[PDB]
Amino acid sequence: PTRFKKCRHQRGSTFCGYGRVGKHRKHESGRGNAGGMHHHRINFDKYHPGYFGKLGMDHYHRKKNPMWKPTINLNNLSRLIAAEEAAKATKGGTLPVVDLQSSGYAKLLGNGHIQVPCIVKARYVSKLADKKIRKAGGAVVLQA
């Protein structure tokens, strides 16, 4: 939409909102991010505090697949057991059998108290996670 613009709204204003003293120029405060340490240093040091440095060691060939560890908490396990799959979790005394990596979620983090007793099968599991489940009628199982 071009009618929904202010230099179309402010025809006849003679400056489209850029003033008479300081005339709208082309690039006049540097061009780009220029001057981050010279004349825009007060902007960078103050809205971008950590910019302009080096830190840590270099990981040359970084592959995000071997460094892939999605996480789910204990209070979010119910997100993987349908009410029908939990309808068998009511009868027969059969604990739910949750398998994380099929839904994503390599690692199992222990946050909150687990609402429903189940047995999760996760590649990775926290110490407090490994302990809340095994003391809530459940069991963590390590896979892969």
């Binding site: 405060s29 780009g32 809205y47 592959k63 697949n65 071997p66 892939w68 099929s102």
Partner: protein, 132 residues
């Protein structure tokens, strides 16, 4: 002025605009609806040409490689010499009756070929191969 904006990093400093001087280096997909129709027209027209053969060949299950995907199964190209030998078919003759052949796969786990050796003899059951 500036102020509390994300440092832009826009990466448009290499004459991509097809201006009056530069030829331009942009790829606009104004033809993808024509191409979707174009391919499905070849596809549906190649299918009645290859008929009664299936348009797509047979491809095996293969395990997507990395730890992110290793639990996801996938259709790889060709089977192996192994599944074909463990199912009778000569990989020279499998590659001519719709079965797709891959002389590079290595059958690292017997688990793997077992899903595919048996997957052949499903095809080799429901295939007529009427002679000429």
């Amino acid at each position: 002025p500036k102020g509390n904006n994300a440092i832009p990093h826009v990466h448009q400093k290499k004459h991509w605009n097809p201006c009056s001087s530069q030829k331009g280096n942009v790829k606009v997909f104004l033809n993808q609806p024509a191409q979707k129709h174009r391919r499905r027209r070849l596809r549906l027209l190649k299918a009645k040409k290859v008929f009664p053969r299936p348009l797509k060949a047979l491809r095996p299950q293969v395990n997507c490689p990395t730890v992110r995907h290793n639990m996801k199964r996938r259709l790889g190209r060709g089977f192996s010499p192994a599944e074909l030998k463990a199912a009778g078919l000569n990989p020279q003759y499998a590659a001519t009756i719709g079965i797709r052949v891959d002389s590079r796969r290595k059958n690292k786990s017997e688990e793997g070929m077992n899903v595919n050796v048996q997957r052949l003899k499903t095809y080799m059951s429901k295939l007529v191969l009427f002679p000429m």
